[PDB]
Amino acid sequence: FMSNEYVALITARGGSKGLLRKNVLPLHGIPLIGWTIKAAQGCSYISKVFVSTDDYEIAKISEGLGALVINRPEELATDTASSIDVILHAISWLEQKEVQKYEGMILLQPTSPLRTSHHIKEAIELYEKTAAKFVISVFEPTHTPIKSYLENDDGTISGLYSNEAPYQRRQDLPRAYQPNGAIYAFSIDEFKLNNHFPRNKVFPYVMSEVESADIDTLEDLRKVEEQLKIKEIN
Amino acid sequence: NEYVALITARGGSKGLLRKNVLPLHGIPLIGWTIKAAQGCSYISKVFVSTDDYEIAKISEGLGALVINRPEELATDTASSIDVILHAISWLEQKEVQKYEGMILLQPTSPLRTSHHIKEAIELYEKTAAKFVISVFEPTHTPIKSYLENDDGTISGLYSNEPRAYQPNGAIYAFSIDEFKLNNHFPRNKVFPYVMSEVESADIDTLEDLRKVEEQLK
Numbered sequence A: 001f002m003s004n005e006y007v008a009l010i011t012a013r014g015g016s017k018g019l020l021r022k023n024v025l026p027l028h029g030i031p032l033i034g035w036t037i038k039a040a041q042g043c044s045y046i047s048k049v050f051v052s053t054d055d056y057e058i059a060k061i062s063e064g065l066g067a068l069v070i071n072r073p074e075e076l077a078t079d080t081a082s083s084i085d086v087i088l089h090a091i092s093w094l095e096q097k098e099v100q101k102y103e104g105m106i107l108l109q110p111t112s113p114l115r116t117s118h119h120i121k122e123a124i125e126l127y128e129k130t131a132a133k134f135v136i137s138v139f140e141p142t143h144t145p146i147k148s149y150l151e152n153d154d155g156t157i158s159g160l161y162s163n164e165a166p167y168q169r170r171q172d173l174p175r176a177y178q179p180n181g182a183i184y185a186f187s188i189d190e191f192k193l194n195n196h197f198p199r200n201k202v203f204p205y206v207m208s209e210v211e212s213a214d215i216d217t218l219e220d221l222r223k224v225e226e227q228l229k230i231k232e233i234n
Numbered sequence B: 001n002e003y004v005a006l007i008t009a010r011g012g013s014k015g016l017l018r019k020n021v022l023p024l025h026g027i028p029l030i031g032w033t034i035k036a037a038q039g040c041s042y043i044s045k046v047f048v049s050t051d052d053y054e055i056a057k058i059s060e061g062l063g064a065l066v067i068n069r070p071e072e073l074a075t076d077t078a079s080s081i082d083v084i085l086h087a088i089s090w091l092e093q094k095e096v097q098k099y100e101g102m103i104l105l106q107p108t109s110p111l112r113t114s115h116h117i118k119e120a121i122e123l124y125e126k127t128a129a130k131f132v133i134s135v136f137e138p139t140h141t142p143i144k145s146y147l148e149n150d151d152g153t154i155s156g157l158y159s160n161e162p163r164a165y166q167p168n169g170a171i172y173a174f175s176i177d178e179f180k181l182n183n184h185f186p187r188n189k190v191f192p193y194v195m196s197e198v199e200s201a202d203i204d205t206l207e208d209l210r211k212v213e214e215q216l217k
């Protein structure tokens, strides 16, 4: 169908495998998660923004900004909790609590603050243009994996893709992509058919390595702060 | 075994302007590679293949010999094979000395030292290799990436999910005679010279150059 509706889902847990409270850390005057909430809200194609959280501060920040809160069960906020299970829970919550029927879900990670409304807009346009079942934001690494080698038992090496691939121009080879975790745009119906992410009609939404920045440490956060400060003062 | 170093440096670039001649810790970028080739005992002569006046002036000034590269071989479309074949042809006409191996070195790898070149040539001799290429093991293994299919879709490169190496572009040590009979890089008896990710730094932007400057102070 030509006319489709989209819902944004932001998954942010309180706990972490590190000694960092990532999702609420200040970045250029606002909590980290705020950059992703605002990117979703700023996009014309997004009807509603939902934040799935178990945390009081994340929920408070989210509601304050105008996003809707999906109260996530304890089991789904553990270090062992599966990405699929959180999505299925959010799909279930939406089907029971939200009257609007959505074709696609735009899953967005709070750890990708350089992914903007413009990136979401473009990813949804690609999703529609290609008749995709799943659009994932990716980047082309500086050292492309299509030009890599694998080690043989005798200690020699051979091209992973082909024998001539490591010596060929990157432009003359199929492109190899690395997902950056910023955007996962998928058909809600196709996700709950296999109860997992679609395996077919998967298209890449290409972003630069610079815009692919993922927050894991205070250094990652410091680097992005400087980048935003540099764009501010020029 | 006698070895000739070939440094391929074109004037043009898709990104960073005058890349090969930009200052890095007191020396033009290319000078780090010229000096790393000259500092290695196994290297008899150092040649710089360029289409550029500035690169040639810097190279001659550092004592390297200049191979004047034709315009078509300095384009964005120009093949790696064609640049090497041209240098092989130039060497066979303009050089009385016969070399068994060619050590192809990129000026964009300034953290690759004489020590790294010595070790790659030692591996080349010890293994009786047809080809030795400097590599690194990336933090994100290439086997876990996606490959773009013909219809525009993506799927896992290797499978839907082994030791992987990524060439860093710093050193290519191969037999000249063997390269001439194949008109391509050897496909067998290829051994990896493993370097760290940190020493595998490649200059493409002013940020890459600034990062190397900082880890050079």
Ligand SMILES: Nc1ccn([C@@H]2O[C@H](COP(=O)(O)OP(=O)(O)O)[C@@H](O)[C@H]2O)c(=O)n1
Pocket: A011, A012, A013, A014, A015, A016, A017, A018, A022, A023, A076, A077, A078, A079, A080, A081, A082, A083, A086, A109, A110, A111, A215, A216
């Ligand atoms: N079961 C989980 C795991 C991570 N996440 C969130 O997904 C983002 C990226 O996860 P991450 O790689 O930083 O992992 P942790 O910080 O949770 O150790 C973070 O913003 C998490 O808050 C979640 O919502 N539910």
Ligand SMILES: Nc1ccn([C@@H]2O[C@H](COP(=O)(O)OP(=O)(O)O)[C@@H](O)[C@H]2O)c(=O)n1
Pocket: B008, B009, B010, B011, B012, B013, B014, B015, B019, B020, B049, B073, B074, B075, B076, B077, B078, B079, B083, B106, B107, B108, B203, B204
């Ligand atoms: N057709 C070409 C392309 C690159 N090169 C050189 O190969 C090195 C690395 O090239 P590169 O991958 O960064 O691409 P460009 O700088 O040419 O855009 C540089 O020192 C280039 O000057 C060359 O000699 N002939």
Ligand SMILES: [Ca+2]
Pocket: A206, A207, A208
């Ligand atoms: Ca873009």
